[PDB]
Amino acid sequence: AFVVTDNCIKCKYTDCVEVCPVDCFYEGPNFLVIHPDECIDCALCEPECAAQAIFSEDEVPEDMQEFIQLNAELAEVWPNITEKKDPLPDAEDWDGVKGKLQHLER
Ligand code: SF4
């Protein structure tokens, strides 16, 4: 599985979904997650994300390990998303700010 990590929050560009062959992105108000059992590890979404928030599970930074199970949990409850949409307003402002987990919306 690939995993969406902190810099997605409050950015949510959603360019990542358009290349996902198996449609395994799930949408929250201000964050996206990858369903780890649906994900086929094709890696195509990783270069598409301007926030550089996507990692293969084995390369998730030590200080973002929580996002691995968070992705698996939220993918069970959020609705699938399979089409590009406009980035969040002020996405640019939040791209690169750390610890945005504190702002995650359910
Ligand atoms: S690695 Fe491939 S299958 Fe997994 S979420 Fe990214 S684009 Fe989809």
Ligand code: F3S
């Ligand atoms: S910011 Fe989030 S919505 Fe996809 S393009 Fe990057 S993982």
